[PDB]
Structure formats: C-alpha cells, structure tokens
C-alpha cells in the first residue's frame, strides 16, 4: 500500500529500495544505520595486500575454463548472464573467487557478478506475522544475484556477548557479521522453511579467508511479489525457539510451535 520511504539505502545501491506498509501503523524502521559495504568497529586488519591476491592472466572475458579465478572454485559458476549454473551445488555451495584488481582482465569480465551489486528491484514491506520483510518487485530467474549480507564485522567472542542476536551471520577463530546497528537490505530478510534464496561465500577485492562476503542468490525462479527468504539454520533456531517460533506458513515448517511440540513427543 503506502510508500513510506522512496529508498531505504539513501542512494547507496545501484537501485532504490522503497519501503511500504499496508498492514499496520509501524513506521519505516530507522533504528540502524544503512551501509552498503561491511564496516569495522575494532582492529580486524583485513589482508588487503595486493600481492596476496590469486589472480588470472586472461585476455578474454574470463569465460574459458583456463581462468585461474574460476579454477579456484573448480570452475566459474556463472553463466553468460551472471546467473549460477543449474548444476551449482545449492546444498553445500563452493567458495567463489571473483576476479579482482590484480587480474589482467577487464572490469566487465564474466566473473564479477557480486562485486557489481544489486540489479533486481526489491521492496521492504510489512509482513503479517514476521515484522518487516523483503520481497521481489519483478520476476527473478533461478541463480540470480539478489543482494549481499552486509553489516558490522565482529569477532566470535564479541558476537557471543551481543545483547541483540537477531541479526548475526556466522562467517564459516570464526568471525561474524552483525547487522543490528549497521546493515543493508539483507537485515530484513526473514527465515523461510521453504526458502527461495541461498547464501554463498564470495571473495572479491581481498582473499582474507576470515572474511568471506555473503551473497544471496535465488534458488529457484521467483514470482513478482514473492517474499524472499533463506534458511537461517539450526545454530539460530536451537537458541531462538525458546523465545519465539516460526511463523511461516509452510506445510514443510520445521520450527513452528506445533512442529517442535510434535518432535518433543519423542518417546
């Protein structure tokens, strides 16, 4: 219904991400800082040494199997339009190494999808039972990059003491992204037991293995208006289900009060 923010990203993304609410009186959420790239709030010393980048020597568009960067994930998984190959492993995704500033190739080579940012039209909107969510304003073919999970990089130890644990994402001495205070559009993506996106670890401008960047891609074709969602995983629900249970929705739901109660009856 009513458009209450023309762009929650304040021009930082390639495209605007509007906010609407046709459900209740909750105003546009502003209790966080929108950022389009990950931030630091303590000394992390991400390894940005250009000489530590593995890089290719391609003089074409990096579409051949000889591209070193592709070979670092056995092959490049992007088709000619920037979408994940049908055969991509959606259960145990590989780590993707995109081309970078040490590579001989051009900025528009075929192995630069995530670093090129958001292209699909998305919307922050009020759901019926799960607060704010994100939905698609267009059809989205399977394998399409949607957005990155961006926030504040923190240590595992800091993550263990964070008072609000509703926006934490484990990268993998493990580090985490907390999108509570600083985050992007991904902070509003809800959990679905029937998910339509999946997270993939990606390297771009650096290859510091502590700090993969988290890219969401569509795991199937997505219809206009559909809510986006991923499976947050059991390392979220084992802790959170004491406080609330899952409000999808789905006949496949594994985390509803009913599901949990049923399994509990385990004699």
């Amino acid at each position: 219904e009513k458009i209450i923010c023309r762009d929650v990203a304040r021009g930082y993304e390639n495209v605007p991400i509007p906010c609407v609410n046709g459900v209740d009186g909750e105003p546009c959420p502003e209790d966080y800082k929108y950022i389009s790239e990950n931030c630091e709030t303590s000394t992390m010393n991400i390894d940005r040494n250009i000489t530590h980048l593995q890089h290719c020597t391609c003089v074409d568009d990096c579409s051949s199997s000889n591209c070193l960067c592709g070979q670092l994930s056995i092959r490049c998984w992007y088709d000619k339009d920037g979408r994940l190959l049908q055969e991509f492993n959606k259960i145990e995704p590989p780590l993707i190494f995109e081309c970078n500033q040490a590579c001989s190739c051009w900025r528009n080579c075929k192995n630069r999808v995530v670093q090129s940012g958001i292209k699909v039209r998305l919307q922050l909107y009020r759901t019926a039972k799960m607060g704010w969510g994100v939905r698609a304003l267009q059809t989205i073919p399977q394998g399409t990059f949607i957005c990155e999970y961006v926030g504040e990089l923190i240590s595992d130890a800091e993550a263990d003491v964070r008072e609000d644990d509703s926006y934490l994402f484990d990268l993998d001495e493990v580090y985490c992204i907390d999108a509570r205070y600083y985050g992007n559009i991904s902070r509003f993506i809800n959990h679905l037991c029937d998910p339509n996106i999946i997270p993939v670890r990606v390297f771009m401008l650096h290859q510091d293995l502590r700090f993969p960047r988290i890219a969401f891609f569509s795991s199937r074709d997505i219809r206009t208006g559909e809510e986006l969602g991923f499976d947050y995983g059991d390392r979220f629900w084992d802790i959170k289900s004491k406080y609330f249970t899952c409000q999808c929705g789905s006949e496949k739901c594994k985390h509803s009060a009913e599901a949990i109660a049923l399994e509990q009856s385990r004699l």
């Binding site: 995704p93 595992d156 993550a159 263990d160 003491v161 964070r162 644990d165 509703s166 934490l168 994402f169 484990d170 985490c176 959990h191 997270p199 993939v200 670890r201 991923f230 947050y232 995983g233 390392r235 979220f236 629900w237 084992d238 802790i239 959170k240």
Partner: peptide, 9 residues
C-alpha cells in the same frame, strides 16, 4: 555451541 543465535550457511 555458542551463547547467541547466528544465521549461517
């Protein structure tokens, strides 16, 4: 297992 909830792959 940790004290706080985290989404993960």
């Amino acid at each position: 297992t940790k004290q706080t909830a985290r989404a993960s792959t």
